Each structure stands twice: as structure tokens, then as C-alpha cells.
């Protein structure tokens with residue numbers, strides 16, 4: 001996260017870190033046994049780390065659980081990033097408490113102007129590389145479809161939305177991928193892509209979760 005602030009230990013209880021010997025993507029806990037992340041975050045040997053703040057130190061409250069299976073959306077296109085969503089089933093159910101909790105799925109899509117919270121352990125620099133130890137936070141508004149499409153001509157599908165600031169300086173970044181975009185207590189987006197990080201006129205692009213609620217429920221119900 002670029003231009004954000006330190007969230008504070010366990011203030012974002014649904015945030016998870018996907019780990020394979022190092023943090024490589026974020027994710028969101030939606031129930032005791034399932035996590036939602038981005039399809040481009042797929043890889044074998046994923047360990048889900050819940051209740052984390054400092055990802056380099058065991059401070060307590062952490063729960064490390066192996067992924068039993070990862071389900072990338074069948075229509076995911078790695079070239080366009082359309083349908084960039086993936087479900088991860090935990091080998092064992094997580095112990096839910098004040099520090100580890102699930103986030104609700106949306107019942108309706110969010111409108112432009114809606115303020116949301118984006119979080120992650122991704123790069124904090126727009127021009128360079130600097131990964132944080134603790135979780136970073138950023139409040140960003142969902143942009144209008146017209147502004148989003150004008151920023152990324154012919155690259156925005158109905159399953160994506162832009163959020164952030166056109167002036168630059170504040171944005172999600174590499175390492176934040178798969179992480180949550182929560183608005184009014186509901187998971188509305190997943191950190192997907194963008195052009196560089198925090199660049200002017202190049203807001204972040206996110207997977208529009210409200211379009212996948214039925215798919216998520218039907219998939220979880222059959223697995």
C-alpha cells in the first residue's frame with residue numbers, strides 16, 4: 001500500500017496473508033473454512049496465515065493453516081485479468097475470535113463515491129521497493145465507470161471497477177494482490193491490477209465481487 005497508514009494490530013480481522021516461505025498475496029476470510037483471493041495469486045504449496053500484523057514475527061494470535069484446495073474461476077483470463085477471483089478452502093476450520101473474523105459478502109453492488117478500506121503488506125513505494133512488516137491501510141473511494149474506462153481504454157470489463165485517487169500518491173501495489181476492498185462492512189473488491197503504483201490518472205483496478213456472490217455460494221456449497 002502506497003500513501004497509507006499503519007492499521008493497528010488486528011484491526012482488520014478478516015485480512016489473511018498467503019505464504020509460501022514468504023508473503024506473496026493477501027486474501028479475505030469469508031467463513032471459518034474459506035478464503036477469497038485473486039486468481040493471479042494461484043500457486044501450489046499455499047499456507048494461509050490468519051491473525052497477523054507483523055508478518056516477520058510471531059506475536060501471538062496467529063493461526064497458520066494449509067490450503068486444502070484452491071479454486072481459480074473457470075473463466076479467468078490471465079491476459080485480460082477478467083474474472084480475477086479464486087477460492088481457497090482451509091485444511092481445517094479457523095478458530096474465530098475478536099482477532100480473526102470473517103467479512104460479509106455483498107448483497108448489492110456499491111456505487112461510485114462509496115468510501116472503502118483497502119489493506120495489505122504490499123510495497124509502500126511508488127518508485128522503488130520497500131515491503132512493510134506490519135499491515136498497512138488505505139481509505140479510497142470507488143470511481144465512476146466513465147473515469148475508470150477513460151483511464152484504461154478497452155481494458156475494463158463489467159467485472160472490474162476502479163478505486164483510488166487520480167492525483168496519485170495513494171494506491172494499492174504489488175504484494176497487496178488478492179487483498180480486500182471493504183465498503184460499509186461488505187467485501188466489494190479484490191486487489192487485482194493497475195499501471196505501476198500510485199501514478200497520476202492510473203487508479204487501481206479491482207475485481208467486482210458483487211458479480212460473483214452466486215458463484216461463490218454455489219461453489220462453496222459443492223466443495
Ligand SMILES: C[C@H](NCc1ccc(C(=N)N)cc1O)C(=O)O
Nearest residue numbers: 040172173192193194196197204
Ligand atoms: C496482476 C499483477 N498486478 C497486480 C497489481 C496490483 C495492484 C496494482 C495497483 N497499482 N493498485 C497494480 C498491479 O499491477 C501482475 O501484473 O502480475
Ligand SMILES: C[C@H](NCc1ccc(C(=N)N)cc1O)C(=O)O
Nearest residue numbers: 079080081155174193194195196
Ligand atoms: C505494473 C505491473 N502490472 C502490469 C500490468 C499490465 C497489464 C495488465 C492488464 N490489464 N492486462 C495488468 C497489469 O497488472 C506489475 O504489477 O508489476
Ligand SMILES: [Ca+2]
Nearest residue numbers: 054057058059
Ligand atoms: Ca506475526
Ligand SMILES: [Fe+3]
Nearest residue numbers: 192193194196
Ligand atoms: Fe500488475
